[PDB]
Amino acid sequence: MKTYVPKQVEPRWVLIDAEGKTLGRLATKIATLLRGKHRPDWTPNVAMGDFVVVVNADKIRVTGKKLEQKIYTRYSGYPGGLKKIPLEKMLATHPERVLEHAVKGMLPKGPLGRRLFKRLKVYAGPDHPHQAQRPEKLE
Amino acid sequence: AKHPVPKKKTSKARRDARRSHHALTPPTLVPCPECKAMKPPHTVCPECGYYAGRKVLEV
Amino acid sequence: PRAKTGVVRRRKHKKILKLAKGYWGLRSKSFRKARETLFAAGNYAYAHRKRRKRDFRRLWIVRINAACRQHGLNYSTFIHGLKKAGIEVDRKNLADLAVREPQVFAELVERAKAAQG
Amino acid sequence: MEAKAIARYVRISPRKVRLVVDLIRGKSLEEARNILRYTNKRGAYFVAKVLESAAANAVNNHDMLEDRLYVKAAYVDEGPALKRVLPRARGRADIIKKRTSHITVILGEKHGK
Amino acid sequence: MFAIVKTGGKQYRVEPGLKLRVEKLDAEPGATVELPVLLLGGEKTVVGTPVVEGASVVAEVLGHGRGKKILVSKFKAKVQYRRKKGHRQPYTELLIKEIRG
RNA sequence: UCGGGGCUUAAGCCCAGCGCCGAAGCUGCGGGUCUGGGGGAUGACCCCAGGCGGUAGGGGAGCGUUCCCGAUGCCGAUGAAG
RNA sequence: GGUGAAAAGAACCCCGGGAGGGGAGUGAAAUAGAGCCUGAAACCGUGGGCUUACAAGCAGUCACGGCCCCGCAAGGGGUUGU
């Protein structure tokens, strides 16, 4: 046998920055706690998604040319597959979907909007009227 | 006999759920002013009755 | 001679029945159904013997890799670090004396780095 | 004690009077009486009558007094039935039933101390 | 204080004085188990390219045993194949002594 | 809608490199199995080389059931079968 | 096709209109009480112990956990959230 029970390892309140950078490497590790890609399987809410809240606040730029349309989607975590929250028409859908693609780009929809909604907004604009951990694994 | 004939057999679950939507609901009774009886609301109790007093033959 | 078919049937019947008790559905209230679902359950059990082993392989690999990330490098490097040097065993799982005891962990990390760097 | 009293092999189908049982199940004598007395039903004053049955045995055969006698259970099953053949148009002869009940009204202890 | 050991295609982290089983052994029922192997200790105790051979780990054994039978009941889904069996894995119980390394 | 997300010093292509991952297939440990050999006078048991995908179908084998023997018997009120 | 060994087949009294019950006596036995040896399952019910209202389902299985009750120990029942 073997035992690797860690109980509640307690919340890691990181909030990394690279908002100016990438569009996919804009995940993977930023994933590991997010997805444009990473963790699904009927459980990982917008929640830990937030955290980072791309606390870097918002949008920025693009790698290729598929501009004039997005703010971003699919693959986040929890039930209906993977999870997200779609695009720009949803800049509207409650609060705005920037490179927070990743997080407040996933998110603004009323339903993961269940997933408490409850961890984000232009809150995430680094005021996030709160407190986190400002080494924030900047890297 | 004609067309809508039970495709398959229903489950006891859904059976007594369909049943579950009907928990037998109790009636309503308030006391009579100057007696001991639970008359239905607004209604005069069989005996006693209302103000002015009438009937009084429900032994 | 008439062999009065008596309780043999009912006994193996309620043998399988007894095996069933713990499920939902009329399977957990029918004989011929319990039976079949139990067959399926057995298949599942074997599958999950071998696959228990393999999914364990998965988790081992995972948290060893994640610890490796939390420090410096990653998995593949880790492995050739052990494998090349000479340490031909470790039982990957046994390395889970890692977060449980980060000390010996860090040192052995330096082993893998040492004899393969 | 737990006063046991019953009246088996009588009418009403399971569903109805089983709901009549779990209508007042867990509520003292007074209320029970006045309720069964006042319900748009058959099992109302019916199960009230078997309640009378239960009332005697606990008052003048168990002796626990009517003021301490609260509604203790009532389980009330299905029993046998009545299997009739119904005439119904186009040569159809069908099987239709009358289901029954096992009204086990019990009454019991008050405070407990 | 721990210690690692590769016993019977099963490798472990054994403590100094507890624990209850291994693979089925051709070893004495209730007497002396000298483990001519070893692969750790406590406060730093690296394993070499081969085993750890500064010395050895020591176990006591408290009798043999069998553990939870599994009915290998694997059937096939159509044209007959209902294999109803059940293997009970035979093993040997222990309880260590120390880790003289 | 490429599984999907998503990817532009690639996460696409070309060429080289080392590393891992990763099957009931292989190593170790443990159990069964039938077989072949030898000790086995030995029955046993022990050791040794090897196969086990398996439907029809071949073949060995193993549980149970009414009743005849065992019986002018044995268990059974301290309690028979179901 | 079945109460018992035999009717000794439940007298007197309490709820009811009775039907049925509730105390009795009786007999070893009253879940032997009048359709009365056994009395499975299907199927229908009572309390209570455990779960389930963010959820995509051949409903089972594997690792873990939370709960209730057996276990001196380790353990175990089973409930089934991930």
Side-chain angles (χ1 to χ4, degrees):
Chain A
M1 285 181 57
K2 211 70 155 157
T3 293
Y4 2 103
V5 178
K7 278 182 174 177
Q8 292 186 25
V9 200
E10 306 302 81
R12 193 63 189 180
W13 275 93
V14 181
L15 49 180
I16 185 171
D17 208 316
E19 63 148 9
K21 213 180 171 282
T22 55
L23 245 69
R25 310 167 183 80
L26 204 76
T28 294
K29 248 169 174 56
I30 256 204
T32 298
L33 263 84
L34 272 170
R35 323 177 81 183
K37 37 105 41 146
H38 236 255
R39 297 184 179 179
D41 307 322
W42 19 88
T43 317
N45 351 253
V46 295
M48 240 192 177
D50 313 290
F51 264 7
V52 190
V53 251
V54 175
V55 91
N56 344 130
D58 43 355
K59 66 322 129 195
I60 287 298
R61 219 205 249 198
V62 54
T63 60
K65 210 185 186 313
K66 35 215 170 184
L67 191 266
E68 205 55 60
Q69 30 185 308
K70 261 72 182 174
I71 11 247
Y72 239 141
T73 173
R74 310 306 167 194
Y75 297 70
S76 188
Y78 229 135
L82 336 300
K83 201 62 138 139
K84 48 283 116 167
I85 266 151
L87 289 95
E88 161 161 67
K89 314 92 187 191
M90 319 244 166
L91 301 142
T93 313
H94 211 326
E96 270 268 21
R97 311 257 233 256
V98 280
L99 197 113
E100 325 208 21
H101 153 179
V103 212
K104 191 203 4 278
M106 293 194 293
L107 285 274
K109 221 175 195 294
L112 237 61
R114 299 119 71 238
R115 286 341 282 191
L116 311 114
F117 158 72
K118 251 177 217 165
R119 257 152 233 133
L120 170 138
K121 268 165 128 162
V122 193
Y123 285 176
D127 316 43
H128 74 322
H130 261 90
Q131 44 90 37
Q133 228 303 90
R134 304 87 190 156
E136 48 194 34
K137 184 152 172 159
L138 196 154
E139 184 49 82
Chain B
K2 53 277 182 196
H3 283 109
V5 178
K7 203 82 165 187
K8 302 287 278 198
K9 183 173 177 171
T10 62
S11 177
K12 350 277 258 169
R14 302 321 194 112
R15 174 186 71 128
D16 272 5
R18 186 213 314 103
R19 232 129 273 172
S20 74
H21 225 305
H22 317 299
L24 192 70
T25 353
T28 50
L29 306 171
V30 326
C32 159
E34 229 276 67
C35 172
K36 181 74 157 56
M38 306 294 287
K39 22 143 70 177
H42 258 61
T43 288
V44 323
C45 206
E47 315 90 50
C48 334
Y50 249 17
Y51 181 93
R54 207 260 148 204
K55 185 65 168 174
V56 201
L57 49 113
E58 256 292 330
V59 289
Chain C
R2 194 192 191 283
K4 180 69 188 64
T5 299
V7 221
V8 180
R9 172 143 37 128
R10 183 155 46 184
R11 276 159 189 171
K12 182 174 55 263
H13 256 144
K14 287 173 313 196
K15 170 189 219 167
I16 313 296
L17 168 156
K18 197 194 211 307
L19 263 319
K21 264 301 178 180
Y23 304 4
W24 190 333
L26 273 197
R27 121 207 50 223
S28 61
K29 252 160 297 301
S30 159
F31 294 22
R32 320 189 260 183
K33 235 303 158 57
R35 214 187 187 211
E36 306 173 18
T37 325
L38 294 169
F39 296 0
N43 295 42
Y44 287 148
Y46 191 47
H48 300 164
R49 290 153 206 166
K50 278 74 225 298
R51 199 81 177 287
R52 177 171 57 187
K53 313 159 192 286
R54 287 174 261 189
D55 179 88
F56 260 84
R57 194 167 244 165
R58 221 58 44 181
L59 185 274
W60 304 358
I61 291 349
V62 169
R63 203 57 168 274
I64 295 307
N65 181 44
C68 195
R69 294 288 183 172
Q70 184 187 135
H71 267 44
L73 355 301
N74 49 72
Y75 185 80
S76 309
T77 72
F78 210 151
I79 326 301
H80 190 58
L82 275 306
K83 199 170 179 178
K84 188 270 168 199
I87 321 191
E88 214 162 350
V89 285
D90 181 280
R91 182 191 169 181
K92 313 175 175 181
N93 197 340
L94 290 195
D96 213 302
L97 230 239
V99 183
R100 300 180 309 200
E101 239 73 59
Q103 13 284 154
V104 301
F105 193 28
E107 212 279 78
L108 295 162
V109 173
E110 292 316 301
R111 296 291 343 275
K113 299 220 306 180
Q116 229 308 284
Chain D
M1 203 24 183
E2 39 204 347
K4 202 169 184 178
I6 215 183
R8 270 183 68 175
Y9 262 57
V10 209
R11 242 268 76 198
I12 320 289
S13 170
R15 247 154 280 182
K16 316 169 188 299
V17 271
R18 191 182 318 288
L19 263 303
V20 174
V21 152
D22 230 343
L23 155 76
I24 66 156
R25 178 205 190 86
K27 231 141 286 302
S28 185
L29 173 72
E30 161 76 72
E31 307 174 53
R33 284 182 174 176
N34 268 287
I35 287 163
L36 321 152
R37 176 69 148 77
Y38 268 77
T39 288
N40 265 13
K41 267 256 184 172
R42 179 178 169 186
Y45 94 102
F46 247 61
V47 185
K49 193 187 309 174
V50 56
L51 179 273
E52 305 296 284
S53 291
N57 318 288
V59 166
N60 280 339
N61 232 88
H62 285 80
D63 196 7
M64 291 157 54
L65 187 75
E66 54 280 12
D67 198 275
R68 283 205 136 142
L69 285 172
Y70 88 112
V71 163
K72 226 155 186 161
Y75 79 75
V76 73
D77 272 275
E78 190 214 288
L82 201 172
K83 201 175 300 183
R84 269 306 172 271
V85 188
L86 182 62
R88 221 75 216 289
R90 275 200 174 184
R92 166 161 292 199
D94 256 336
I95 176 252
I96 151 187
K97 331 97 187 173
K98 267 261 205 179
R99 330 280 301 278
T100 174
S101 301
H102 292 320
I103 312 94
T104 324
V105 186
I106 290 150
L107 324 310
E109 231 159 58
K110 192 196 174 192
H111 288 295
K113 51 240 292 186
Chain E
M1 192 205 174
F2 317 94
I4 275 64
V5 45
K6 185 189 51 187
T7 157
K10 305 168 307 100
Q11 317 169 231
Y12 307 122
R13 190 214 66 182
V14 301
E15 278 240 314
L18 25 116
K19 157 133 292 298
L20 291 95
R21 67 86 54 184
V22 297
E23 200 102 53
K24 187 165 184 172
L25 280 189
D26 192 46
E28 273 292 299
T32 68
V33 173
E34 151 62 42
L35 301 281
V37 290
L38 227 185
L39 284 314
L40 231 273
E43 337 278 91
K44 176 175 299 185
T45 14
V46 68
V47 0
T49 291
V51 297
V52 139
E53 196 201 327
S56 285
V57 31
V58 177
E60 226 291 291
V61 54
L62 311 169
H64 313 306
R66 221 149 66 150
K68 233 47 189 301
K69 184 175 169 182
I70 306 296
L71 66 159
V72 268
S73 59
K74 17 204 175 183
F75 107 117
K76 269 304 179 175
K78 254 147 63 64
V79 60
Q80 145 232 309
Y81 196 138
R82 291 162 51 180
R83 285 320 179 274
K84 209 175 185 178
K85 269 97 65 166
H87 268 184
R88 198 173 193 231
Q89 266 278 261
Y91 56 66
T92 49
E93 286 213 55
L94 277 104
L95 187 323
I96 321 188
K97 190 82 156 58
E98 37 96 310
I99 50 269
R100 46 148 266 168

